Amino acid sequence: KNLDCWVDNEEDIDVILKKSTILNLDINNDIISDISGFNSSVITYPDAQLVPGINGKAIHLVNNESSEVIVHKAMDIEYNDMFNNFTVSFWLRVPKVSASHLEQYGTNEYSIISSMKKHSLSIGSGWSVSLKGNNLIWTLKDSAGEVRQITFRDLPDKFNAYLANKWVFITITNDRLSSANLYINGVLMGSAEITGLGAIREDNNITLKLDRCNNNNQYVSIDKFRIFCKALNPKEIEKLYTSYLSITFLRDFWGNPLRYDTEYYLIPVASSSKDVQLKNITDYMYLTNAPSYTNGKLNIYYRRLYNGLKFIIKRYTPNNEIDSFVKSGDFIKLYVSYNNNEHIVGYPKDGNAFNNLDRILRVGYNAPGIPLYKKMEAVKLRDLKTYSVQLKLYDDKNASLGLVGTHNGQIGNDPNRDILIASNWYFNHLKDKILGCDWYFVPTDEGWTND
């Protein structure tokens, strides 16, 4: 803590994050402003775009020189990082680079955030955040012209990868008396020795914009951009990361808010390589293997997306109000979209159920006279870091029919399958690290396109 900023009380992480923050980009009524107490100024150019963020709206940048945000560092923070420790933390969302783009822009490195005066592949001093292929780069440069750099390679499985259009949380801490550490989602991804460079003298503006990017199509989103005047520690990091994740909103596979009337494919967290298939209208659902995509020469692979059943969420009692956002604790009707029709998902009174308890879900059941329970509550009962949802079924008396999940079993002469069910069993295993009632809601997205 020798080169850290504040000098008061080294115990309360919550209070430490606040007191040590020196720049803080928040967005309110469509304006980006600094919300640390320093009131640095931010100038939002004309083509800076706002999109859903992990908690309110975020900044979306596209590839024209008029899509940018500038921060004019205030008087009393202007120089902080010339010698002291600083930490930069932000949420990022980069689209899965298409294999074509990996071929033709894979050696093109460009910035998205930078404190460092630029000129025709010649650089000032300061730092930048840059992308080159599927690499995320941190980069410190000092008055003498000396550089320190971290290069984090994204894993080759894009379903899991940090640079494949999911929101991820970046934090970079630089302790001038030791290292620069690169974290993603609270984990240490990369690091380098920064002992030895002196005097980081940079631009008086922090700049948000794509810089020297060859692909006319790139975009990226940045939220909650923040500068602390210290190398935060991982226990500080963990707390900073989870603080952004308030349960009150459910999220889609990408980290964006869960909405009604929109098509999502279901993929189970515990079985991420499966899609949902349906036996027949009126019948059960089961897990089947999704088709996968590999490419050797590019070192990349993913299970493909956009097949299996699409579902749609609707409010139980719906009509007049304005929130298209599914709140955890909301009661919904779940439907399957198959040829323009909406077939509600439910469990009919007395439908088979393994063992009398794991109730086999049914798509489109219509047996006259037979009650069909379809009131669901979508909830976030665990695993906050994972953008996943749980779904609870009720019968028509407000008794619980269980969380939605699967159960291996056999039905008639179809083969062994993992059939979708509703069961109260899950409710005793809620601390498990992996659970079978955990769902990803996946909407089509510009950022992910199967090649």
Ligand X SMILES: CC(=O)N[C@H]1[C@H](O[C@@H]2[C@H](O[C@@]3(C(=O)O)C[C@H](O)[C@@H](NC(C)=O)[C@H]([C@H](O)[C@@H](CO)O[C@]4(C(=O)O)C[C@H](O)[C@@H](NC(C)=O)[C@H]([C@H](O)[C@H](O)CO)O4)O3)[C@@H](O)[C@H](O[C@H]3[C@H](O)[C@@H](O)[C@H](OCC[Si](C)(C)C)O[C@@H]3CO)O[C@@H]2CO)O[C@H](CO)[C@H](O)[C@@H]1O[C@@H]1O[C@H](CO)[C@H](O)[C@H](O[C@]2(C(=O)O)C[C@H](O)[C@@H](NC(C)=O)[C@H]([C@H](O)[C@H](O)CO)O2)[C@H]1O
Q: Which residues bind ligand X (CB under 6 A)?
A: 354-355, 357-358, 405-408, 421, 423, 425, 436
Question: What DSSP character marks residue 355?
Answer: T
- Give me the least distance between CB of 386 and ligand X, in Å please: 16
Cβ-contact 25, 42 below 8 angstroms: yes
Rounded distance between C-alpha atoms, residue 270 and residue 248, angstroms: 23
- Give me the least distance between CB of 398 and ligand X, in Å please: 20
Say if residue 379 is exposed, middle or buried (CB neighbours under 10 Å; 0-12, 13-18, 19+): middle
Nearer to ligand X, 269 or 357 (CB): 357
Rounded distance between C-alpha atoms, residue 246 and residue 345, angstroms: 29
Nearer to ligand X, 104 or 355 (CB): 355
- Give me the least distance between CB of 405 and ligand X, in Å please: 5
Q: Provide the token pair at 206.
A: 């922090």
- Give me the least distance between CB of 428 and ligand X, in Å please: 9
Residue carrying the six token digits 């439907």? 335
Nearer to ligand X, 70 or 357 (CB): 357
- Give me the least distance between CB of 186 and ligand X, in Å please: 26
Which residues are within 8 A (CB) of 252 and not within 5 positions of it... i.e. 6 or more apart?
258, 259, 264, 387, 441, 442, 443
Cβ-contact 270, 429 below 8 angstroms: no
Residue carrying the six token digits 């009150």? 248
Nearer to ligand X, 203 or 358 (CB): 358
Picking from 419, 408, 410, the residue whose alpha carbon sits closest to that of residue 284 is: 419
Nearer to ligand X, 330 or 418 (CB): 418
- Give me the least distance between CB of 43 and ligand X, in Å please: 53
Write the single-letter amino acid at 94. V
- Give me the least distance between CB of 437 and ligand X, in Å please: 8
Nearer to ligand X, 176 or 274 (CB): 274
Rounded distance between C-alpha atoms, residue 213 and residue 198, angstroms: 30
Nearer to ligand X, 402 or 443 (CB): 402
Residue 166 CB neighbours (<10 A): 24
Nearer to ligand X, 348 or 443 (CB): 348
Nearer to ligand X, 271 or 337 (CB): 271
Rounded distance between C-alpha atoms, residue 71 and residue 65, angstroms: 16
Rounded distance between C-alpha atoms, residue 40 and residue 33, angstroms: 8
Rounded distance between C-alpha atoms, residue 186 and residue 234, angstroms: 7
- Give me the least distance between CB of 338 and ligand X, in Å please: 25
- Give me the least distance between CB of 356 and ligand X, in Å please: 8
Cβ-contact 363, 336 below 8 angstroms: yes
